[PDB]
Design a protein around this ligand. Structure first.
Ligand code: 2PG
Ligand code: CL
Ligand code: K
Ligand code: K
Ligand code: MG
Ligand code: MG
Ligand code: MG
Ligand code: MG
Lengths: 436, 431
């Protein structure tokens, strides 16, 4: 039985407040923390902020916390919904809010209760979280699938000070045999990258962006990718490490065109590209570099551009801001054949149940699912268990630097150890990890 | 009963491997992770690294993990140890290694076991970790004392000093101190990007900004501006870590030591460097200065100590080692210990180090390493030891926030049986 639900303010990896929920049962105290985006899609569920300029730069979550303690908590404890019944838990929370985008209580009030419930349920059932999440999602556990980590080792766009427009340049050690091997390889590439970056661009270029990637002040993707290819070679892992992008192109979409200098106030609008221009450009990057995944190559509502590009892309295309982990918007994307992978962010939609439905809808359409952190992360490690539970075969959760990233990657080490011979590493088959 | 001791490799905040230990009892599995320094004192207990250049850039901890699994673990379980008896735990571990500097098994093999035992012990007692640690250290718990966070918001080490910390001593609670710190940090980042360019706001290992700054005066002016912009002038003070061993050469101190052609004729003596510190101290609200002189430069410490009028913290001088601390007390070199558990390698020795310090009228600042993990032990430790001061990062990167958040939780849990050390941080233990 749930005896207590309680929310507090804690700090995320950027030093901004976010919501922590504790759910108490006879099995103990279960804690979940809400992450926070920077390049947030306009269609994400409401992140409720206080907007008091005199506290926390206006980024307080006191109102969200209050909604937990004063509205959700009394009703939820009164109800004593079976924590194992995740559907009912989230039915309760969603109906309590009663709005489309969780704008009454806030998605960052609801999500912590949603997640903490699932932790309590796993403990009641005497199983690891990932196993409960497998149960919840009706996912195969024989064997489990461990994910390829997509490691954002070079940070751009809104995550790092500098010219570089494209938000993320990820390495994916698909050629590794185990998760632990993938993570060692990833770390080695990263450290070689850091050294090369500092030599090429100066020492302070070795300081890191929000997600732990190095942050050289460079203008072009080709520069970035050269760095990374050099780093892969230097670490000795040629052929075993591939590349993924997050363009986050909504962040530089304007007037129906795309500005690859968006962080420059003096941006020359005469250099702003177009839908086809951008697609053909992507094609050429894909020709010259071992890129196996591109995310948000076009803007969050630019459906026709997505559709046209997908026709001929030939690699995994990930929807992030396009779909915002929302089954409704995923349905559209599926119909239009705009993408073939979902980026899963639980706090884009605000409950576990809806997140699981998003994943299931995606898999059913022959899509992949990459489970994802936000750029504002915490010491919470839920998504490590989530990506294994959901059997997706791919996660992105940072560079191998800053422990809001390592916390997830370390937890995946632990899960792999526990699973032993009852897991396979997705490797080259990350895209259809669920079908393994 | 302890039925298993186990080690694995995990990754620290810089993406280098480190040792994680789990200890299993009837209360379950208890986990501790070992941190790792970069500016490590030559007298630190041995961090055992593999040196296989073909793996992990040579920074593997396979050997240390092996020492846990293959040497410590079987002997430990066989010894039927009471985890509540931390001295017995650590006596065992220290005897098993049998070297002064823990060079046989590695400090990073031993410490994880030491820390995990204390967690197992708290669970057996059904108390929070900080309460058990208070027990172990015979600290006063009426009230508990919550620490001032010293937040490393700006880094050097052209700028020679390594850390520039802010300390919200003027806050009324820890929760208030943390908010103020976060707002100052964010104001600092905004000014830094404005004045030094966008790239300058990208963070260093401990979450601080590191713009190209020539001199300490320039750094400190920037922090004062940030504090004022945040609206907290008068409530936020400053701490330094000079890490002066890093620019100690040929008996003098090179304040431009990143310059390959630094003018040797301008390198400072002990007295001269002291003079510079003094001018800084007079002109800025600095209330703590750490490692102002090198790790065996005793006379320079002693000289400065006679006229310095603020907390002087020993880090590389003392490396959390009761034997070195005794020397420092005798020579009147400093009046505060930086406590790093992995500098000495067991909890018991760390607690003794703290008690020796306190008994000599010293303060104690519990400290992270520059390489941290999601482990939050030092949050519970600084409360357990009642020291009233911790440094564990800027309020950025969650290997830092993890500790600071845990302190939020402890403060909330203790309610009116805790006080915030505030301006009284130096003798927090005597409050
Ligand atoms: O766009 C992204 O994919 C996410 C994760 O990297 O970033 P943010 O949380 O800032 O939206
Ligand atoms: Cl005293
Ligand atoms: K012995
Ligand atoms: K004095
Ligand atoms: Mg985004
Ligand atoms: Mg994205
Ligand atoms: Mg040091
Ligand atoms: Mg120091």
């Amino acid at each position: 039985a749930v005896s207590k639900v309680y929310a507090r303010s804690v700090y995320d990896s950027r030093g901004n407040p976010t919501v922590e929920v504790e759910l108490t049962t006879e099995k103990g105290v279960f804690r979940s923390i809400v992450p926070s985006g920077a390049s947030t899609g306009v269609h994400e569920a409401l992140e409720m902020r206080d907007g008091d300029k005199s506290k926390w730069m206006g980024k307080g979550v006191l109102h969200a916390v209050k909604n937990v303690n004063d509205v959700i908590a009394p009703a939820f404890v009164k109800a004593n919904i079976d924590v194992k019944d995740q559907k009912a838990v989230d039915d309760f929370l969603i109906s309590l809010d009663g709005t489309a985008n969780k704008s009454k209580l806030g998605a960052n009030a609801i999500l912590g209760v949603s997640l903490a419930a699932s932790r309590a349920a796993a403990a009641e059932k005497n199983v690891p979280l990932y196993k409960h999440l497998a149960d919840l999602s009706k996912s195969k556990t024989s064997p489990y699938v461990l994910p390829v980590p997509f490691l954002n080792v070079l940070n751009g766009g809104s995550h790092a000070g500098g010219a570089l427009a494209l938000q993320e340049f990820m390495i994916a050690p698909t050629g590794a045999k185990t998760f632990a091997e993938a993570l060692r390889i990833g770390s080695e590439v990263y450290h070689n990258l850091k050294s090369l970056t500092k030599k090429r661009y100066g020492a302070s270029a070795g300081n890191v962006g929000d997600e732990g990637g190095v942050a050289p002040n460079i203008q072009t993707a080709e520069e970035a990718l050269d760095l990374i290819v050099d780093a892969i070679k230097a670490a000795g892992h040629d052929g075993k490490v591939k590349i993924g992008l997050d363009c986050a192109s909504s962040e530089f979409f304007k007037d129906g065109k795309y500005d690859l200098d968006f962080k420059n106030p003096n941006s020359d609008k005469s250099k702003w590209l177009t839908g086809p221009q951008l697609a053909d450009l992507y094609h050429s990057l894909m020709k010259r570099y071992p890129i196996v995944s591109i995310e948000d190559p076009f803007a969050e509502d630019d459906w026709e551009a997505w559709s046209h590009f997908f026709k001929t892309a030939g690699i995994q295309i990930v929807a992030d801001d396009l779909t915002v982990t929302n089954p409704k918007r995923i349905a559209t994307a599926i119909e239009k054949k705009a993408a073939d992978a979902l980026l899963l962010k639980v706090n884009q939609i605000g409950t576990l149940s809806e997140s699981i439905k998003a994943a299931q809808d995606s898999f059913a359409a022959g899509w992949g699912v990459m489970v994802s952190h936000r750029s504002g992360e915490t010491e919470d490690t839920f998504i490590a268990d989530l990506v294994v539970g959901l059997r997706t075969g791919q996660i992105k959760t940072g560079a191998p630097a800053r422990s809001e990233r390592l916390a997830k990657l370390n937890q995946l080490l632990r899960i792999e150890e526990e699973l032993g011979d009852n897991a396979v590493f997705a490797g080259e088959n990350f895209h259809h990890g669920d079908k393994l």
